[PDB]
Structure formats: C-alpha cells, structure tokens
Design an enzyme around this catalytic site. Structure first.
Site, PDB file in Angstrom:
ATOM      1  N   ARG A 179       0.950  -0.975  -0.066  1.00 28.79           N
ATOM      2  CA  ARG A 179      -0.277   0.594   0.145  1.00 28.79           C
ATOM      3  C   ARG A 179       1.229   1.153  -0.457  1.00 28.79           C
ATOM      4  O   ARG A 179       1.013   2.001   0.872  1.00 28.79           O
ATOM      5  CB  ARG A 179      -0.753  -0.597   1.159  1.00 28.79           C
ATOM      6  CG  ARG A 179      -2.080  -1.101   1.338  1.00 28.79           C
ATOM      7  CD  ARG A 179      -2.232  -0.911   3.000  1.00 28.79           C
ATOM      8  NE  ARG A 179      -1.039  -1.352   3.797  1.00 28.79           N
ATOM      9  CZ  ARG A 179      -0.629  -2.469   4.123  1.00 28.79           C
ATOM     10  NH1 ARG A 179      -1.221  -3.406   3.474  1.00 28.79           N
ATOM     11  NH2 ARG A 179       0.113  -2.325   5.172  1.00 28.79           N
ATOM     12  N   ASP A 244       3.151  -8.574   6.436  1.00 28.34           N
ATOM     13  CA  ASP A 244       2.222  -7.139   6.589  1.00 28.34           C
ATOM     14  C   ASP A 244       0.756  -8.182   5.938  1.00 28.34           C
ATOM     15  O   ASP A 244       0.430  -7.692   4.639  1.00 28.34           O
ATOM     16  CB  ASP A 244       2.333  -6.438   4.984  1.00 28.34           C
ATOM     17  CG  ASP A 244       1.457  -5.510   4.979  1.00 28.34           C
ATOM     18  OD1 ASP A 244       1.298  -5.589   3.769  1.00 28.34           O
ATOM     19  OD2 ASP A 244       0.934  -4.770   5.798  1.00 28.34           O
ATOM     20  N   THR A 245       0.889  -8.990   6.543  1.00 28.90           N
ATOM     21  CA  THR A 245      -0.558 -10.469   6.460  1.00 28.90           C
ATOM     22  C   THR A 245      -1.332 -10.570   7.638  1.00 28.90           C
ATOM     23  O   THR A 245      -2.245  -9.801   7.856  1.00 28.90           O
ATOM     24  CB  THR A 245      -0.107 -11.427   5.670  1.00 28.90           C
ATOM     25  OG1 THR A 245       0.872 -12.172   6.903  1.00 28.90           O
ATOM     26  CG2 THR A 245       0.553 -11.384   4.357  1.00 28.90           C
ATOM     27  N   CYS A 350      -1.042 -20.556  -0.105  1.00 30.42           N
ATOM     28  CA  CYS A 350       0.294 -19.993   1.062  1.00 30.42           C
ATOM     29  C   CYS A 350       1.214 -21.172   1.841  1.00 30.42           C
ATOM     30  O   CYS A 350       0.536 -21.404   2.328  1.00 30.42           O
ATOM     31  CB  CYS A 350      -1.101 -19.317   1.628  1.00 30.42           C
ATOM     32  SG  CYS A 350       0.002 -18.094   3.062  1.00 30.42           S
ATOM     33  N   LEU A 351       1.849 -20.984   1.398  1.00 32.44           N
ATOM     34  CA  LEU A 351       3.016 -21.227   2.313  1.00 32.44           C
ATOM     35  C   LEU A 351       2.785 -21.201   4.316  1.00 32.44           C
ATOM     36  O   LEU A 351       3.412 -22.206   4.925  1.00 32.44           O
ATOM     37  CB  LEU A 351       4.931 -21.336   2.328  1.00 32.44           C
ATOM     38  CG  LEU A 351       4.960 -21.876   0.906  1.00 32.44           C
ATOM     39  CD1 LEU A 351       6.151 -21.692   0.718  1.00 32.44           C
ATOM     40  CD2 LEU A 351       4.071 -23.882   0.172  1.00 32.44           C
ATOM     41  N   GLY A 352       2.724 -20.097   4.383  1.00 32.51           N
ATOM     42  CA  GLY A 352       2.681 -19.591   6.119  1.00 32.51           C
ATOM     43  C   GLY A 352       0.942 -19.504   6.381  1.00 32.51           C
ATOM     44  O   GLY A 352       0.501 -19.373   7.316  1.00 32.51           O
TER      45      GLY A 352
HETATM   46  C1  HEM Z   1      -3.795 -14.086   6.736  1.00 25.25           C
HETATM   47  C2  HEM Z   1      -2.475 -14.323   6.318  1.00 25.25           C
HETATM   48  C3  HEM Z   1      -2.570 -14.548   4.903  1.00 25.25           C
HETATM   49  C4  HEM Z   1      -2.805 -14.119   4.007  1.00 25.25           C
HETATM   50  C5  HEM Z   1      -4.750 -13.633   3.955  1.00 25.25           C
HETATM   51  C6  HEM Z   1      -1.626 -14.769   2.822  1.00 25.25           C
HETATM   52  C7  HEM Z   1      -2.122 -14.535   1.530  1.00 25.25           C
HETATM   53  C8  HEM Z   1      -1.588 -15.003   0.228  1.00 25.25           C
HETATM   54  C9  HEM Z   1      -1.452 -15.879  -0.879  1.00 25.25           C
HETATM   55  C10 HEM Z   1      -3.351 -14.987  -1.243  1.00 25.25           C
HETATM   56  C11 HEM Z   1      -0.740 -15.912  -1.900  1.00 25.25           C
HETATM   57  C12 HEM Z   1      -1.030 -16.184  -2.934  1.00 25.25           C
HETATM   58  C13 HEM Z   1       0.049 -15.684  -3.599  1.00 25.25           C
HETATM   59  C14 HEM Z   1      -0.332 -15.534  -5.858  1.00 25.25           C
HETATM   60  O1  HEM Z   1      -0.498 -16.619  -5.827  1.00 25.25           O
HETATM   61  O2  HEM Z   1      -0.194 -14.760  -6.558  1.00 25.25           O
HETATM   62  C15 HEM Z   1       0.358 -16.191  -0.439  1.00 25.25           C
HETATM   63  C16 HEM Z   1       1.519 -17.096  -0.781  1.00 25.25           C
HETATM   64  C17 HEM Z   1       2.768 -16.948   0.382  1.00 25.25           C
HETATM   65  N1  HEM Z   1       2.946 -16.732   1.456  1.00 25.25           N
HETATM   66 FE1  HEM Z   1       0.810 -15.650   2.108  1.00 25.25          FE
HETATM   67  N2  HEM Z   1      -0.791 -15.133   3.502  1.00 25.25           N
HETATM   68  C18 HEM Z   1      -0.788 -15.074   4.606  1.00 25.25           C
HETATM   69  C19 HEM Z   1       0.691 -15.527   5.328  1.00 25.25           C
HETATM   70  C20 HEM Z   1       1.664 -16.041   5.501  1.00 25.25           C
HETATM   71  C21 HEM Z   1       2.925 -15.517   6.524  1.00 25.25           C
HETATM   72  C22 HEM Z   1       2.270 -15.694   8.093  1.00 25.25           C
HETATM   73  C23 HEM Z   1       3.975 -16.225   5.489  1.00 25.25           C
HETATM   74  C24 HEM Z   1       5.627 -16.302   6.529  1.00 25.25           C
HETATM   75  C25 HEM Z   1       6.097 -16.654   5.815  1.00 25.25           C
HETATM   76  C26 HEM Z   1       3.720 -16.629   3.989  1.00 25.25           C
HETATM   77  C27 HEM Z   1       4.224 -16.767   2.982  1.00 25.25           C
HETATM   78  C28 HEM Z   1       3.654 -16.822   1.812  1.00 25.25           C
HETATM   79  C29 HEM Z   1       4.757 -17.518   0.822  1.00 25.25           C
HETATM   80  C30 HEM Z   1       6.009 -17.608   1.072  1.00 25.25           C
HETATM   81  C31 HEM Z   1       3.946 -17.710  -0.215  1.00 25.25           C
HETATM   82  C32 HEM Z   1       4.543 -18.182  -1.845  1.00 25.25           C
HETATM   83  C33 HEM Z   1       4.041 -19.546  -2.466  1.00 25.25           C
HETATM   84  C34 HEM Z   1       4.568 -19.124  -3.732  1.00 25.25           C
HETATM   85  O3  HEM Z   1       4.132 -18.569  -4.068  1.00 25.25           O
HETATM   86  O4  HEM Z   1       4.100 -20.447  -4.224  1.00 25.25           O
HETATM   87  N3  HEM Z   1       2.068 -15.857   4.686  1.00 25.25           N
HETATM   88  N4  HEM Z   1      -0.564 -16.045   0.993  1.00 25.25           N
HETATM   89  C1  LIG Z   2       0.114 -11.301  -2.264  1.00 21.51           C
HETATM   90  C2  LIG Z   2       1.206 -11.885  -1.099  1.00 21.51           C
HETATM   91  C3  LIG Z   2       0.080 -11.899   0.408  1.00 21.51           C
HETATM   92  C4  LIG Z   2       1.797 -12.937  -1.023  1.00 21.51           C
HETATM   93  C5  LIG Z   2       2.746 -13.627   0.270  1.00 21.51           C
HETATM   94  C6  LIG Z   2       2.912 -11.847   0.315  1.00 21.51           C
HETATM   95  C7  LIG Z   2       1.925 -11.115  -1.090  1.00 21.51           C
HETATM   96  C8  LIG Z   2       3.077  -9.653  -0.493  1.00 21.51           C
HETATM   97  C9  LIG Z   2       3.412 -11.469  -2.285  1.00 21.51           C
HETATM   98  O1  LIG Z   2       4.067 -10.868  -2.673  1.00 21.51           O
HETATM   99  C10 LIG Z   2       3.205 -13.045  -2.578  1.00 21.51           C
END
Ligand code: HEM
Ligand SMILES: CC1(C)[C@@H]2CC[C@@]1(C)C(=O)C2
Ligand SMILES: [K+]
EC number: 1.14.15.1
Length: 407
Positions: A179, A244-245, A350-352
């Site tokens: 943002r 920032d999630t 999402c891995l997180g």
């Molecule tokens: C409310 C919590 C969260 C939401 C709603 C969220 C949402 C998302 C979404 C929509 C994507 C897919 C983006 C795409 O397809 O281009 C993603 C991927 C990913 N997230 Fe989460 N996220 C959250 C928390 C976290 C946390 C705490 C971590 C800690 C490391 C994390 C790490 C990642 C990573 C490494 C990916 C990449 C997966 C890939 O590209 O194969 N996220 N997330």
């Molecule tokens: C879109 C996302 C929420 C997902 C994890 C952090 C984020 C900003 C990335 O660019 C991939």
C-alpha cells in the site's frame, strides 16, 4: 480524468469499469464492501479498469479460480499491478511458474511449514498472553500498534533470527510494496529490502544457524546448492508474508468483534467454535489481491486477452461472491460450507497459512477469556486502506477493567 490510461484497441468499451485497487470509491463502507461493488448486479464476470495503467479484473470466484489453475496462460512472472511493480517483482518462488517454481517452494515450505509452526506453538501462546495481560487493566488500547503489529511480527522476527529493533525499517519497506504512500516505488522498496538481507545472508552462509534465514541460505534445491541471489529473493518474500499479512487481518476481525457483542458471546459461551469462526472471519475479511500476466493471446470467457495484458485475480473476491456463499456479507460461525481463496489457489497456495491460523486462533482464545467485553472508542471513525494487501489504519478499543479476568 487524467488517472485513466487510454483504452487499448482490443478491449471492448462495454467492459470498462474503472476500479482503482489502491483507492476504491466505496472505501468508507469498508474495504471488503468497497471491492464488493465489483459483484453488484449488471457488472460482468470480467472487466477492464483504466486505472493504474490499465488491466483486467476477474470479479467472480469461478474465473479467479480457473485462471490461478492455468499457469501456462496466466503467468506469475509479472504478478503485481501496476506494470512497473510487476516487472521489478522477482521474489521466489512467487514470480515463477511450474515446473521451475516447485524446487524452491519445497525449500520455503521447510522454514515456515507445519512442523515449524508446532515447535513455535508455546512461544506464540506466551507472547499473546503476555501482550493481552499488560493491556487488560488499562481499559483501552490502540489495537493496531498494541497487538496486531507486535504479536505476529515479533513471532516472525524470532523465526528469522532477526533483531526486533529492525521492525520499524522493515515494516515500512513491506508496506510500500503493498500500500505505497507515494514516497517509494516497489523497485526502491525491494532494492532496500535486498540491501538489508545481503550481508546477513553472506554471514549466515559462513556461520550457519538454525533460523529461517540460515536454513534458506544454506539449503539445496533439487539436490544442488542455492545461490546467494536466490536466497535473497526467497528471504525477501518471507519478510513480506510475515510483516504485512496476519497483522492486517487481526484488525479486521477485532474491529468486527468489538462491533458485534452477539458474536463475542457466542465464542465466550462456546470456545470450541473458535477454529470454525477463524475460517469464517478469514472468508468475510479476506484481504489479498494480486494477479498474473498473459503469456500469449487467449480467449477467456468470451473475452479476447492479448499477450502482455495484466489481469488482477482478487483472492478477496471469491469468498464474498454470493455465487459461492449465500448472504456472503453476513458472518455466520456455523456456516456449513465456508468457501474462499483467502490463502490463494493453484500451485502458489500460501505456505504461511498454517502459521497464520495458529496466530489467529490463539489471539481469539486468549483475548476473549481475558477481555470478553469491549468496544470501539466512542465517536471513532474507522478508516480502511486498500492495495495488494488491505488493512486497518487504526483501531481504538475501550473496555471496563472490572469486567475482565486474569487466567
Ligand atoms: C492472513 C494471513 C495470510 C494470507 C491471507 C496470505 C495470502 C497469500 C496469498 C493470496 C498467496 C498467493 C499469492 C499468489 O498466488 O500470487 C500467498 C503465498 C505465499 N505466502 Fe501467504 N498469506 C498470509 C500469511 C503468510 C505468512 C504468515 C507467511 C510467513 C512466511 C506467508 C508466506 C507466503 C509465501 C512464502 C508464499 C509464496 C507461495 C508461492 O509463491 O508458491 N504468508 N499468501
Ligand atoms: C501476495 C502476497 C500476500 C503473497 C505473500 C506476500 C505477498 C504480498 C506476496 O507477494 C505473495
Ligand atoms: K518480474
């Protein structure tokens, strides 16, 4: 208006709907409500906005899901709106499509996946209880600063082996990627994030540790050693996901709970509903929206997409679609089939998300058993902000200390 890129020849005039993902017109009604205008009657399944350089938007879960599955036509190579952001975006594994994506995803899944979450359980529990107790007898708090930020962020910084005093710098950088306030482009923010990581990655390749950064930097991908650049590109993404999630989602949930005493009561009287409530809040208060770029000319749902066209595929919109969930704007902790793409869809799931659910569920339990009755500060006008990830500007809460308990 001057904020509207001229409509390309190949884009049908009747499909124009000038939605601005960084400042949507109906923002004051709530950010989810603001995006929901894309699903009002007479709005097509797939529109074109002239805002932010011009791009497609899929407005319904059906198309959002299909596109995320079709990586051959819809590439992750340029996943951010606007175009300049998407082109600079080189995070790993997100900026990659299968087959090349997978080897890196397995390495990242090792450092934030379920087995890591389980060993983090007790520290997560302790931090939540610690924060909530210190806030309790005060009868008020600024929830974004006082809980939503330090609770998940300190947890990630622990995982990553990074000093908490770095949070203000890193947090500012991630927020410019999601943002932007205008002071920094995505390119400048990323370069600064990479600048932060470089000497840390080098020093932890000489003296390896057990922190997430050491594990990535010294890891292997499909049997061959990961390079310095690769590790940097992967670590940078981890900082964004961690900073920032969950931070933003917690504020949405707690804003709701402060304005809905009936719902608080439901979870107080029946705490075993907290996991189900978590998923429903995850649906109703979905907050992420990124997308893909067309690899070639392709007709999609009666619409001609050209090579290089960007398409936003809002993860947020799926679960708010009345075609997936009846009365989608109503929160029902007993909702039978909670349908959403809040954590994404396809090969980039999402891995997180396992870390995220634990942090949400623990917050809910530990807050309600200590501060069961609370509300918004009198007269407070809650502002939301919109972008790649949406959030809450400030959430002032008040309560009567005498109504609280110590556990
Ligand atoms: C409310 C919590 C969260 C939401 C709603 C969220 C949402 C998302 C979404 C929509 C994507 C897919 C983006 C795409 O397809 O281009 C993603 C991927 C990913 N997230 Fe989460 N996220 C959250 C928390 C976290 C946390 C705490 C971590 C800690 C490391 C994390 C790490 C990642 C990573 C490494 C990916 C990449 C997966 C890939 O590209 O194969 N996220 N997330
Ligand atoms: C879109 C996302 C929420 C997902 C994890 C952090 C984020 C900003 C990335 O660019 C991939
Ligand atoms: K790119």
């Amino acid at each position: 208006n001057a904020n509207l890129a001229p409509l390309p020849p190949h884009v049908p005039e009747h499909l124009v709907f000038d939605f601005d993902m960084y400042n949507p017109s109906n923002l004051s009604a709530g950010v989810q409500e603001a995006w929901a205008v894309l699903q009002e009657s007479n709005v097509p399944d797939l529109v074109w906005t002239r805002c932010n350089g011009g791009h497609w938007i899929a407005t319904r879960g059906q198309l959002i899901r299909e596109a995320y599955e079709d990586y051959r036509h819809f590439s992750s190579e340029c996943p951010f709106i606007p175009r300049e952001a998407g082109e600079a975006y080189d995070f790993i594994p997100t900026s990659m499509d299968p087959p090349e994506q997978r080897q890196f995803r397995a390495l990242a899944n090792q450092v934030v996946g379920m087995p890591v979450v389980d060993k983090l359980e007790n520290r997560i529990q302790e931090l939540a209880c610690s924060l909530i107790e210190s806030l309790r007898p005060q009868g008020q708090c600024n929830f974004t600063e006082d809980y939503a930020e330090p609770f998940p962020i300190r947890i990630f910084m622990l995982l990553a082996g990074l000093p908490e005093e770095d949070i203000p710098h890193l947090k500012y950088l991630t927020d410019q990627m999601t943002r932007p306030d205008g002071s920094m482009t995505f390119a400048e923010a990323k370069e600064a994030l990479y600048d932060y990581l470089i000497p840390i990655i080098e020093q932890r390749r000489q003296k390896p540790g057990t922190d997430a950064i050491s594990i990535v930097a010294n890891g292997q991908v499909n049997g061959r050693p990961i390079t310095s650049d690769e590790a940097k590109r992967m670590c940078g993404l981890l900082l964004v996901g961690g900073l920032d999630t969950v931070v933003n989602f917690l504020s949405f949930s707690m804003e709701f709970l402060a304005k809905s005493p009936e719902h608080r009561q439901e979870l107080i009287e029946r705490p075993e509903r907290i996991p189900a409530a978590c998923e429903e809040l995850l649906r109703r208060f979905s907050l992420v929206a990124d997308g893909r770029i067309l690899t070639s000319d392709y007709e999609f749902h009666g619409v001609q997409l050209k090579k290089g066209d960007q398409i936003l595929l809002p993860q947020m919109l799926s679960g708010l679609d009345e075609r997936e969930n009846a009365a989608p704007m109503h929160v029902d902790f007993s909702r039978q089939k909670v349908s959403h793409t809040t954590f994404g869809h396809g090969s980039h799931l999402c891995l997180g998300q396992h870390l995220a659910r634990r942090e949400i569920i623990v917050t809910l339990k530990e807050w309600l058993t200590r501060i069961p009755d609370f509300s918004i500060a009198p007269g407070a006008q809650i502002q939301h902000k919109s972008g790649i990830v949406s959030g809450v500007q400030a959430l002032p809460l008040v309560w009567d200390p005498a109504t609280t308990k110590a556990v």
